[PDB]
Symmetry: T
């Protein structure tokens, strides 16, 4: 794969309770949109979601051996807690863009601390699922001349 | 009606490291007592223990689909560290009670902070295994008012 | 008496102001429940409430002369401010359980601090008036297995 | 005058491109503005731009935006993000929603740059993606305003 | 009275519990020694103890009307909490020496802060009952060189 | 309609010590002025001062049973220390204006924090007794437009 | 004599941003009312609003030239950020009263800090536009007793 | 095994990405060296690595059941985040030595805090792979005097 | 080789208020002193004062296009608050020396923080007007040995 | 010697500078009072002052081999900075009383922290030279059965 | 009229390890430039360097007995640690100017705090050896206008 | 000397007399062991201990001039206090290894701060005397491949 999209814990819940509370959009809808968007630029894109920190770190190591040129990651809650994830990304030295659906600054003060943002190329928060599209747009421009 | 009891990391060792350090009470004994208690009010009681954060997050997602009405959780050490667990409980919107056998306020200062307590119905700490029963008792009465 | 229940300031308000705000349950109701629960096990139970910190300190000193084995205390606001209260309990060396009707951890940041919790056998918060019954059940069971 | 989108650029962004092109590329504030105007006009959205090194001018500009019918502000406040409560209270006082943009990754720099008087009140924030950040915010704006 | 000795909350417990392990010295023993020491110098000395903060503040007000020249105070736990007490002593402008039986720097970190010490002439902590005699000795020398 | 004016500890010392030092105005003088302003508006006005926190809490509870529409409180030292006072005012749900004679921000750092100000309608500090009269003016306009 | 009232940034919005949000009153209404009040007591009163820090600072420098006796200032957001403004007021040594329409202590934590309050005579917050009149009333009494 | 070696997340990357970035040395070379070293002493040694925190907790539990006498652990990023790991080691009560390849104190401030260091026998950092041989040397001497 | 001297807000008030407050020296005197010193060394020297942050930033930008080689800046109160000023000086990349008349370390704690000092060549404070001369001496010497 | 008195840096200046500033009392006067006081009770008493930390530490190691039973130390400025001095006293395990002439709590905030006070038997501050006599008075009664 | 220049620890190393890292200039050179400058103005100038804090303290005590009018001090590392040094300077009451060769603000955060700056007449940092000369120039002007 | 070992204050106390310790081992015992290990490797090794900071700084300056390749330092208490020590090791630019006998992370919170750790090659703590041997071991390998 060329672009790898990673989703952290609890994102599999998007759409799954009370459609109005969070709308109808699902994690699979988001993935579909991104696959199609990368097919239109003739880029191979893969995706991965897990609630387990270990699997996400294993996934990043595998990305190195697969030739991935850029990670788009929504670490979800792990932004605030996971030094392991920081070190997996630095270790394999694949550039990444951090994405959040919601504005994390608008929430509890503990959510203003990150172990990832300072090492990301850039960060997009609060723009919903479209944040991933923009991230992908950026990555496509930067990867093909 | 389903109630789910969740035990976090290291709670499997109860009873195992010496006859005396906090009892012969094992996790299995506790679980058996709570099972009996819940039968007597015709409540279905599930239990679950794991040392892996991700397994606990999965189990909570699973509870949403099972129509579990309330969660009694001893997150053990994850109380202090796991934002992912907080967001799992919030994401499924199943109300919960936090339980600890020991008094977390009597110990090191880093144990005074929690990512769950502020979102729990309530908290019971320091009353040993009976804390799980009290929480069950409370749950029984709040489900059939 | 064998067991003393102490209520701190403002708890005399319970169930006076607009009985559809926070319910129709007085301190009186709680004390009645508790007295009966204690009678069932042949334990003499005393109760006390005051808005005056000095009155509560005097009452704790009197408990010492009366051979009180354990104190169940809801200090309300005093949990955050009264080292005099911590020192009265430690000075008489009577073990105590701390109880709050509401989840103190869900309120303003200043309510996260206590001058009592770290010396309590245990704490129960947020489970309403039932918190006191649970505390009494534990106490009965520790005092006479 | 009337406009739907207002783009605000705070202090020092007029310097873009002008010191030693070697250092931080050849791209200028006017380049950025041209690109945003082209983009807006291509979606039939009216867009206006403003830059100043003076805080009170930016505040006046936001008050002016209220009487012009502006629906969304894309603001790169630059250094004012860390210091200007007045700016926050301007955006809030006129109740025009905004998106915050930074060319550079502000989390990658000094610790005093991690705090903002704006970010918590923004719809969202884009930092570190250079001039595309603005374009993405316009994108988002266009989709929210004319579905 | 020329000199007034004030004891804050809980100090009435001294000598009451298991005196052979927690000391046999009582507050009354302390008061008797200070009174004899003051009679020796032909100084009139009074004493007051209360568990109630408002009683102590009232007593400090009354001291101004009685022409007390100096106060020796062991505020006990109130040293850490009572601004009211600081504004009582400052409002009547009667100089004071702060005394503690025990060394407060050797206990919990919250006991290292005081609302009185910065305004006291000086402090004696950790020398037992003699702390009071020493304060008295200093006071006698000051009032009549 | 009653307004109640509460004065906290030490305010009884006003104008007693070297009236050349901090002024001639007494607490009774302040009360005389507020009663005149109230009577001029045909509003009933009650005043209360105590050095004891308990007396103040009880007084606030009584105000609830007496139909008091609004409280003007100068808590003096209690504004920095008394969560019980906060909870009494909130528990009776009578709105209130906080007054201080002096400018508390010009004094020691610990005097900058208040357990009341965030729940007051507003605060006046540093304008002497006129601060009370301003609060009362505001209150009269609020009750009888 | 002259009093000068200064209004800081964004106060020009008063009234205009929806009657819905905070009452019907406007900055010019406030200024009109205050001119009338000063004319009544034979005092000259000038007014000034600006969104720019330097315009305010220049205005205060001019006030010294004009022999202004007292400044009534609503700095709005600048109370939290502007050391320039503090040093302007201190530099011309014109005493001032700080005024806010809303209760700053009831809002975000960053609005509890001021670079002015400690050097003001006093502060009035949360009483609406009456805060300005009370300030004038205080100022008239200071100037012409 | 008498002695167990544990490597935390990301240590499997040693020697992979550009054998000139951090040399050619690999996690396998280290384990090789330590197994040989143990053999010379007639001590059985096991080794283990995982990116998943729960795997590491599980392996510590297993170690109790294997009679392991000492643990040499390089928790890597988990030293800063994992209370779960701390409580695993304390719960099985097996002494441990913490090892880090790099000087952890020379990097970002967040890397200076550890949930393990205070309960280790001791710590070795910054001495590359030899760190583990030294720990092993120490452990051999502790078990075979 | 042109040097630019920038004086920040309020420095235009030097001399004005009661000449005995810190003597008679005015901003104009200072500029004349430095203009002469610059002419004696055949160095073009420009000066600038403003109370407006914006004008100062515009000034620094124009300094780039004018080929200014070094700036001597007394930012007065803006040292503590203006990130915009920092970013202007780094944006144009003109080295600067920071000067203060008074000892900023001997005043309020807020004056101990600066957004300029860490990026200046160095800093002189508390040496009165000679501070600016010393800076120009250093600057002259740097610019033409 | 069974009692050693240590004076830290700068105490050698007592009396010296304008005896109409902080008295005519010198370090030697103090020593003399203490020596006579000790002689009256047939206890030998040694004294030592130095401005050098290492001399104080060496002096404490000596006292160990001299059978010194108690140290009375006024460490002066070292109480806030010297861990070496702390470790000396603890290393030799000679109990000590800390003395200061002035009320250290009435000064700068950095002066409230001590590396000694938590390990002293007790502390006396603010009572001038008599503080040393009081310490000695206690020490005599301690040493003697 | 004598001036004393004091150099703290490590400044003896100036020029020693690779004249090609931090110039060829030595402490001797600086001292030479200063003795010359002082001669030109008929001022007597003493100099002193030590790696030992007590030696520097003694040298300040000596400066008092020799009638030294002003001290120019580069305390190097001791500016962040030595309150003994602060109190020597204060205790002898000789005015001082603080000097540092480098910009301490541009280095580690612990280097921002000083025990001396707040009490110095002033401070010069980052202008190299010329800072001592400027300090001397200021001192000469103040001793003999 | 190719290698220099430095011991800081109070380590002279190791052995016989006892800083309340288990080991029986003395500072000379350690030194003999180290000299022997160094002779065996044909490497020359000097040692040094002092309770005087200044002496240690001097020793470090002398090491530059003696051609010392590497310093093994146990600074004991100085590791938390001494920036002069840090600046001496950086000044002479001799690489060092920091060694503590005890686990410094296991004791008081002030002991977790170091002014040396971040600039050492590495640190060993808690492994007693063997920590120094390990560090000698490492250095030997580094100086003689």
């Amino acid at each position: 794969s060329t672009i790898l999209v990673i989703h952290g814990p609890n994102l599999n819940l998007l759409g799954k309770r009370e459609p109005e509370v969070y709308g109808h959009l699902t994690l699979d809808n988001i993935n579909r949109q991104l696959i199609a968007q990368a097919e239109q630029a003739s880029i191979t894109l893969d995706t991965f979601q897990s609630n387990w920190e270990g699997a996400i770190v294993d996934r990043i190591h595998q990305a190195q051996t697969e030739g991935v040129k850029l990670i788009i990651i929504n670490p979800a809650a792990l932004t605030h807690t996971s030094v392991a994830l920081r070190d997996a990304l630095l270790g394999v030295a694949i550039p990444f863009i951090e994405v959040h659906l919601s504005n994390v600054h608008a929430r509890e003060a503990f959510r203003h601390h990150s172990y990832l943002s300072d090492k990301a190329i850039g960060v997009i928060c609060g723009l919903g699922a479209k944040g991933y599209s923009f991230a992908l747009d950026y990555a496509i421009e930067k990867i093909q001349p």
